[PDB]
Amino acid sequence: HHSEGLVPRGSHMEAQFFTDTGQHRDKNEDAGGIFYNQTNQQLLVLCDGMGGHKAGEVASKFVTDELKSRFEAENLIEQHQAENWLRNNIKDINFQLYHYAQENAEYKGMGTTCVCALVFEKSVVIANVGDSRAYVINSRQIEQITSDHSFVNHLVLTGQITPEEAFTHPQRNIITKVMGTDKRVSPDLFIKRLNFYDYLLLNSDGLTDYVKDNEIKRLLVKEGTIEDHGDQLMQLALDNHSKDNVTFILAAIE
Ligand SMILES: [Mg+2]
Ligand SMILES: [Mg+2]
Numbered sequence: 670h671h672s673e674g675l676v677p678r679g680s681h682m683e684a685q686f687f688t689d690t691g692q693h694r695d696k697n698e699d700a701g702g703i704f705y706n707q708t709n710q711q712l713l714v715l716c717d718g719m720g721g722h723k724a725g726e727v728a729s730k731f732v733t734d735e736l737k738s739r740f741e742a743e744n745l746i747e748q749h750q751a752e753n754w755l756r757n758n759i760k761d762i763n764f765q766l767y768h769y770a771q772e773n774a775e776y777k778g779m780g781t782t783c784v785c786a787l788v789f790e791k792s793v794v795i796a797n798v799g800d801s802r803a804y805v806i807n808s809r810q811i812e813q814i815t816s817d818h819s820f821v822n823h824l825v826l827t828g829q830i831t832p833e834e835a836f837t838h839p840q841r842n843i844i845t846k847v848m849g850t851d852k853r854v855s856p857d858l859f860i861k862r863l864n865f866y867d868y869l870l871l872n873s874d875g876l877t878d879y880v881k882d883n884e885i886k887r888l889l890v891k892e893g894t895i896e897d898h899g900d901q902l903m904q905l906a907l908d909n910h911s912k913d914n915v916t917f918i919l920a921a922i923e
C-alpha cells in the first residue's frame with residue numbers, strides 16, 4: 670500500500686564534483702561522481718580509499734564504478750525505498766570488494782569509505798560508511814548529517830575527548846568502519862529535509878581535517894556560483910595545508 674502513490678517528481682540539484690591529489694600523497698585515492706538513472710534521478714557518490722592499506726585508489730574507484738553501474742541500470746527508486754536500495758547495494762558492493770581484496774595479492778587489505786546521497790524533491794537520503802561527510806548549510810547553520818566512523822569520534826561520543834581535542838589528536842586518522850575489510854557492513858542511513866538549506870556538501874576528510882565548519886559556512890554563504898565556491902573551497906583546504914587528497918561535491922538546493 671505504501672507504493673500506491675504518485676511517481677517521484679523530477680528533482681536535481683545543480684551539483685559539481687571537485688578533487689585534487691594535494692601536495693603530500695603519491696596518488697589520488699579519493700573517487701566519486703554524480704550519476705543519473707533512467708528516469709534522471711540523481712545519485713551523489715564520494716569515496717576515500719585508505720592510504721594506510723594497499724591500493725586505496727582501486728577500492729574507491731571500484732565502489733564508485735559499481736554505484737554508477739548499478740544506479741544507471743535502475744529505472745526508478747521510490748523515496749521510501751531509497752534507504753533500502755542504498756543499504757542493499759552498499760552491502761553487496763562491500764562483499765564484492767572484500768573478495769576482490771582477498772584474491773588479488775597486489776591489493777590485499779584495500780578498502781574505502783563511501784558517503785552517498787540519493788536526491789528527491791523535498792529530501793535527500795544518505796548512506797555513510799567511514800569518515801567522509803555529508804552536510805547541509807544555510808546562512809545560519811552548518812549541520813553535519815553523518816557521524817564519522819573514526820576512533821577519535823568514538824572518543825568524542827563517549828566523552829573521553831572534546832571535538833577540539835579530536836581535531837589535533839595523534840590518532841585522528843584511524844577509522845572504525847570501512848568498505849572492503851569485512852564480509853558484512855552496516856551503513857548508517859539518514860533522511861534530511863532540504864526545505865531551508867542552500868547547499869548539500871559531501872566531502873572527504875582532506876577537506877574537514879583542515880578546514881573547520883565555521884570556515885566552510887562563511888565561504889559558502891557569500892554571493893557566488895557553485896564553480897566559484899568549489900574553486901575557493903579547494904583553495905582554502907590547500908592554503909590550510911591539507912596533507913591529504915581533497916574531494917567534495919557541492920550541490921545547490923534551489
Ligand atoms: Mg584516502
Ligand atoms: Mg596507496
Ligand SMILES: [Mg+2]
Pocket residue numbers: 800819841842843874878
Ligand atoms: Mg580521517
Ligand SMILES: [Mg+2]
Pocket residue numbers: 717873874875913914
Ligand atoms: Mg582522506
